[PDB]
Subunit: 311 residues, 3 copies
Amino acid sequence: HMFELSDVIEGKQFDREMLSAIFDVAREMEKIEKSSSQSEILKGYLMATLFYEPSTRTRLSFESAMKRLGGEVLTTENAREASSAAKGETLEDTIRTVEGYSDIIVMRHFESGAARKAAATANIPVINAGDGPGEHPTQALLDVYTIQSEIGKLDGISVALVGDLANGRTVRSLAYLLAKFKDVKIYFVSPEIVKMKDDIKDYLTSSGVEWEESSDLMEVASKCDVVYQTRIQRERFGERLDLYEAARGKFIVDKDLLGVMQKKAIIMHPLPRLDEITADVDADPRAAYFRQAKNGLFIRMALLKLLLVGW
Amino acid sequence: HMFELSDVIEGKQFDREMLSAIFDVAREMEKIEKSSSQSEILKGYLMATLFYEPSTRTRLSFESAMKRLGGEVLTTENAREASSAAKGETLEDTIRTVEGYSDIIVMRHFESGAARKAAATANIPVINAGDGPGEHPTQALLDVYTIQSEIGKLDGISVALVGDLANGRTVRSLAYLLAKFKDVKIYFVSPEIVKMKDDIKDYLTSSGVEWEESSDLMEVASKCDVVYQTRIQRERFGERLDLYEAARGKFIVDKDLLGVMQKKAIIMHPLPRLDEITADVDADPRAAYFRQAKNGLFIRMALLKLLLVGW
Amino acid sequence: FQGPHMFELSDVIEGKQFDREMLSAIFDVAREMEKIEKSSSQSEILKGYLMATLFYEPSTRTRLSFESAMKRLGGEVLTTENAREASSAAKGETLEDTIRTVEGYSDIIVMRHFESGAARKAAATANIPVINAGDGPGEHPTQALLDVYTIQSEIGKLDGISVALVGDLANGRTVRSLAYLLAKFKDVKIYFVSPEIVKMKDDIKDYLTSSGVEWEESSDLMEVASKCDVVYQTRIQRERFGERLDLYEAARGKFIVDKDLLGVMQKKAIIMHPLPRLDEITADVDADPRAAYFRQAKNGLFIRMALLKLLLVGW
Ligand SMILES: O=C(O)C[C@H](NC(=O)CP(=O)(O)O)C(=O)O
Ligand SMILES: O=C(O)C[C@H](NC(=O)CP(=O)(O)O)C(=O)O
Ligand SMILES: O=C(O)C[C@H](NC(=O)CP(=O)(O)O)C(=O)O
């Protein structure tokens, strides 16, 4: 029974029914991962990774997921310097040739739109591991799985998206997924120079999702189930380091912020964090960003299985 | 029965009978690669890769070949920065060390002659994945396999070698292999500054192989079974990027060139290409460079099997 | 059916963690691993386990020997060959956050870092075993383990021997950890032979004096070498000199292992070097049977197989 997606590129590809089904597979993958026996579901399949930007979680969780299911991995951990991209090769030619050696490609690129172009080129599945400041659909998938796992529900919740929303490929993809549930309220909390872009706002409005911008993080956090913090995306600011430092340091998750949050609310962060979540938050049971990262293993196991061998 | 070569370093090591037999094995490997069952021919064997220059096809095709045969791989994707070559270690000490962890070494180096020095140090097989602007024997092997596969014949054909011939480790090795067949005519088409070096010319003349220099690519291409285009090798020009740019734009494979070529002729390119084959050409069935790269998987599977377990 | 018997260490971070009886037992395991590595059968001892490597400094032997060891035992590896450029350390992530995240994907972490003390911090953060593959100029405990194994294998003993530690002692994380392990045996005499600017640091000297280990500084390598069982040469640690290249160059060329040095050494003595070498062991020496540094490097495979097995599945 074939998986309905040929590639995982954009958050809009997912409907509510598909998300619930993927979450069920991820819970089964958690059982496999905990098990003593080595799974062979993906024995014989090869994944090629192509990372043109740095990564710890997304690269290693995809590789670990593949190996835990019995598959193998062909890595390119720095494609800008060590692949023939360094000789001038286009992404499209890279994808065309790498598909000759592999069964699925995981690619992170520095240009928005790169993953869509890769999927159009390739006749094997492509997974977008982040395309510039564009999208990050598997982050969004594991984020919603984490919320459902931590809060117990997705309908009716209030979610604060905090920090660099303009450049945040994570919060952009997450916004698309949250719009598939009902009675979700989203607060945008950011410096004005990195407010959420109009393509997301217009999509949410067209989808009848209530959203509000606010600069009062303590007030917003007091009434949210989820506070989703982000890193200010320095690599997207070019030479405008004045604007980078202007956007930094203005919205911090600290012990005082936790003190106004409900007992059953959570803090999330796709990671890495710099200064925007203080270290003393980590000890709070509501600090969910390391459980969130761990959950990416099971979500990516589920996606690799579904794309390669189906439901 | 053991393979007659202990290392794969230079095109001159091959003879016609050996080439034919390797191609026969590559065709069997294509059946293995297609099959549903994961092969175990090389279970228990370990390949070490040592890439001191960038690579996409050569590095990933060797790793994929090894894993498709059931073996494993110890990768060094950027030996200059991430291996103890960065501390000043010689190539010979690197090779002597790495053989303690592995059964076969695949090395791409920036100095011509490096692969022969590695083979002389090692007591396990070494494969030259490119040694500066010197040679690239497995590229030449897959190139001749591709010509036989596409054209149906090697004896009697006409082959144009186009582009940066002086620095082209690909065309240098290919010339050595073409010399092993009967009545091959080779055309050299290049800017004067990157014409084929005298060592190749003298070898061909001494071996009775007809070659001809021409600056009229349209005329040459109308007469050839194979037009083999190359990238101008920017990394060999040092800081003389003025002479590099001056050598570009003079010999382009475009739809106009395809328009004068015979119906049964092909375009080849070891890749990557920049501007020297236009995107239009890819849609012509005669554009063989992506099939060529795919064939490298099967040829490299054949070589690994032969070097490690024999016939 | 009583289950595993856990190794007494939870992490391999510092040479002082080892005791004499544990070292002897580890060496026995390494000899068993040599039989496994040589066998035509693929071992499955570590089937299903994953090692994450995190290399923030260059490596050939340490990185590849750990990966080869893991695979020869049937385990798998998640590599980060250049963590500074290709991991989210490049975005500014702390070591502690990196370790906490990477343990979610793996069962053991092998880390080489540029700061002394990094491995201690990683072990404190992680709830899976961490192995220190080198923490700045601090320590290199698995080099020291394979070094002592090599001495036992080549010389036949560790008690009573004389060992010359030669070269850059100040910055040598290898000789620093080796000194801690040599102190666990009886009547070992240690000679320090170095340029003054890279003499052995006081923390090691004070530890040896407190442990009753006789040590002596000398500038006469021919004299020292003639009365030692082991001459352990090192590379002058260029990267630790940073911009002070004039001091680096002046520390070179003073203490060379060459054919003349071998000529004054005993028949049964050996030359060791954790590698890489530059000029400080001449090529001539490689042909002498006493030149042990490539056997030493090979022995690292067996010692690291032993450590991975012990830390993941026990005795
Ligand atoms: O980098 C961020 O701040 C968020 C996000 N982070 C990740 O995906 C985690 P990693 O970079 O470790 O794979 C990204 O967009 O890459
Ligand atoms: O680089 C070229 O232009 C031709 C040739 N290309 C290859 O081998 C393919 P790759 O660099 O992707 O491994 C080379 O000499 O490396
Ligand atoms: O670098 C040296 O001179 C000694 C020592 N060398 C090693 O561990 C071997 P490698 O760097 O190849 O892993 C080190 O401290 O890293």
